[PDB]
């Protein structure tokens, strides 16, 4: 069909790269399924919340992490104030997406961005970053979901190999 299946595994990366892959999954017409494995950094947790609500799964071994925007600043005294205010705009940006997608107020999330803190799989469903726990039972449904969407393209592949032979 038209479903997009992305896998999430990143322990670092810049904060701006996570927002680009967030809205790259928003403007897709069809649904999107995001599966978090290993960790979820500041660039990876935004990709995890960018999927369709109801198809987000986090395994027990995966650990979601919320991180402040790290940046490199160098310039004069007039230039050091304008880019540090952009850090306040990015901190307003990542707290806005975390508020509209997790059913949480903006004040309680902004009390979490001042210090780095790692989250577990049980705290991911409680905050609202995901929907279900990716246990061994619901992982079998992910195997059968990616089998029908790949055989829809492989049925055309089976007809091209028989026509060439």
């Amino acid at each position: 069909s038209k479903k997009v299946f992305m896998i999430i595994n990143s322990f670092g990366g810049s904060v701006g790269n996570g927002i680009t892959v967030h809205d790259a999954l928003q403007f897709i017409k069809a649904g999107s399924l995001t599966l978090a494995l290993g960790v979820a950094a500041s660039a990876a947790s935004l990709a995890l919340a960018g999927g369709t609500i109801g198809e987000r799964y986090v395994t027990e071994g995966c650990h979601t992490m919320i991180h402040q925007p790290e940046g490199g600043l160098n310039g004069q005294a007039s230039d050091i104030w304008i880019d540090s205010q952009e850090i306040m705009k990015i901190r307003l940006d990542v707290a806005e997406i975390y508020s509209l997608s997790t059913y949480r107020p903006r004040h309680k999330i902004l009390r979490d961005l001042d210090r780095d803190f790692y989250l577990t799989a049980m705290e991911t469903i409680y905050y609202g970053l995901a929907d279900e726990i990716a246990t061994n039972e619901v992982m079998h449904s992910i195997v059968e979901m990616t089998n029908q969407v790949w055989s829809y393209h492989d049925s055309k592949q089976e007809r091209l190999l028989e026509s060439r032979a």
Partner: peptide, 12 residues
């Protein structure tokens, strides 16, 4: 904005 843009919360 970009054409075809829609929020996942607005779709819910």
């Amino acid at each position: 904005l970009v054409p075809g843009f829609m929020l996942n919360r607005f779709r819910k």
